[PDB]
Structure 1
Amino acid sequence: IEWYGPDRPKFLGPFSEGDTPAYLTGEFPGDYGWDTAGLSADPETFKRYRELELIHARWAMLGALGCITPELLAKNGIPFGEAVWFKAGAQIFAEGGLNYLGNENLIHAQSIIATLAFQVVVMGLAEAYRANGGPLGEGLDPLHPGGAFDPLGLADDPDTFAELKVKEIKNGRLAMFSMFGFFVQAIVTGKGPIQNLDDHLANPTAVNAFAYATKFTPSA
Structure 2
Amino acid sequence: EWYGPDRPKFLGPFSEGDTPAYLTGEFPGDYGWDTAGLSADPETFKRYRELELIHARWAMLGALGCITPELLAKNGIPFGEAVWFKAGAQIFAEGGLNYLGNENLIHAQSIIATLAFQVVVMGLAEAYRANGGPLGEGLDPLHPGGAFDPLGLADDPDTFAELKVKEIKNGRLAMFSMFGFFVQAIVTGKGPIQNLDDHLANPTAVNAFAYATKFTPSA
TM-score, normalized by length of structure 1? 0.98
Shift of 1:75: 1.1
Distance 2:181 2:142 in 1: 26
Moved segments of 4+, more than 6 Å: none
Q: Distance in 1 between matches of 2:131 and 2:27?
A: 22
- Equivalent residue of 1:49, what SS? helix
Aligned to 1:133: 132
TM-score by length of 2: 0.99
What is the CA–CA distance in structure 2 between the aligned matches of 1:65 and 1:206, rounded to whole Å? Answer: 28
Distance in 2 of aligned mates of 1:13 and 1:50: 22
Unaligned runs of 5+ residues in structure 2 are none
TM superposition shift of 1:87: 0.7
| Range with greater deviation from structure 2 (209-218 or 97-106) | 97-106
Q: CA deviation at 1:19?
A: 2.1
The Cα shift of 1:16 comes to: 0.8
Q: What CA distance in whole angstroms lies between the structure 2 residues aligned with 1:168 and 1:101?
A: 30
For 1:33 and 1:189, locate their aligned partners in 2 and report how far apart those are by CA, in whole Å: 34
Q: Any idea what the Cα deviations from partners look like across 1:87-126, whole Å, max 9, x if unmatched?
A: 1101000000000011122000001111000000000100
Question: What's the counterpart of residue 4 of structure 1?
Answer: 3
What CA distance in whole angstroms lies between the structure 2 residues aligned with 1:29 and 1:77?
41
Cα distance in structure 1, aligned partners of 2:78 and 2:103: 11
**1:123-177 CA deviation, whole Å, 9 max, x = no partner?**
0100000011110001100110000011101121101110000000000000000
Deviation for aligned residue 1:9 = 0.8
Match of 2:36 in 1: 37
Distance 1:148 1:52 in 2: 22
- d(CA) in 1 for partners of 2:71, 2:122: 28
Counterparts of residues 25-104 of structure 1 (less than 5 Å):
25-104=24-103
Please report how far the alpha carbon of residue 77 of structure 1 lies from its aligned counterpart in structure 2 after TM superposition: 1.1
Q: Residues of 1 paired with 2:81 and 2:6: CA distance?
A: 49
CA distance in 2, matches of 1:207, 1:197: 10
Alignment partners' CA distance in 2, 1:114 and 1:19: 53
Indicate the SS of the match to 1:85: coil
Q: Give deviations 1:25-53, integer Å, cap 9, x for gaps.
A: 10000000000000000001001000000
Distance 1:206 1:159 in 2: 48
- Tell me the distance in 2 between the aligned counterparts of 1:219 and 1:118: 45
Identify the range of structure 1 (100-109 vs 171-180) with the bigger mean alpha-carbon deviation.
Answer: 100-109
Structure 1, residues 166-201: CA drift from partner, whole Å, max 9, x if none? 000000000000110100010001000001000100
Q: Structure 1 stretch 50-59 or stretch 16-25: which is displaced more? A: 16-25
CA distance in 2, matches of 1:87, 1:70: 11
In structure 1, C-alpha distance between the alignment counterparts of 2:204 and 2:18, rounded to whole Å? 36
**Structure 1 residue 83, shift from structure 2 partner:** 1.1
Distance in 1, matches of 2:83 and 2:6, equals 44
User: How well do the aligned residues superpose, as a CA RMSD in angstroms?
Assistant: 0.6
Q: Select between 97-106 and 58-67 the one with higher mean Cα deviation.
A: 97-106
Gaps of 5+ in 1: none
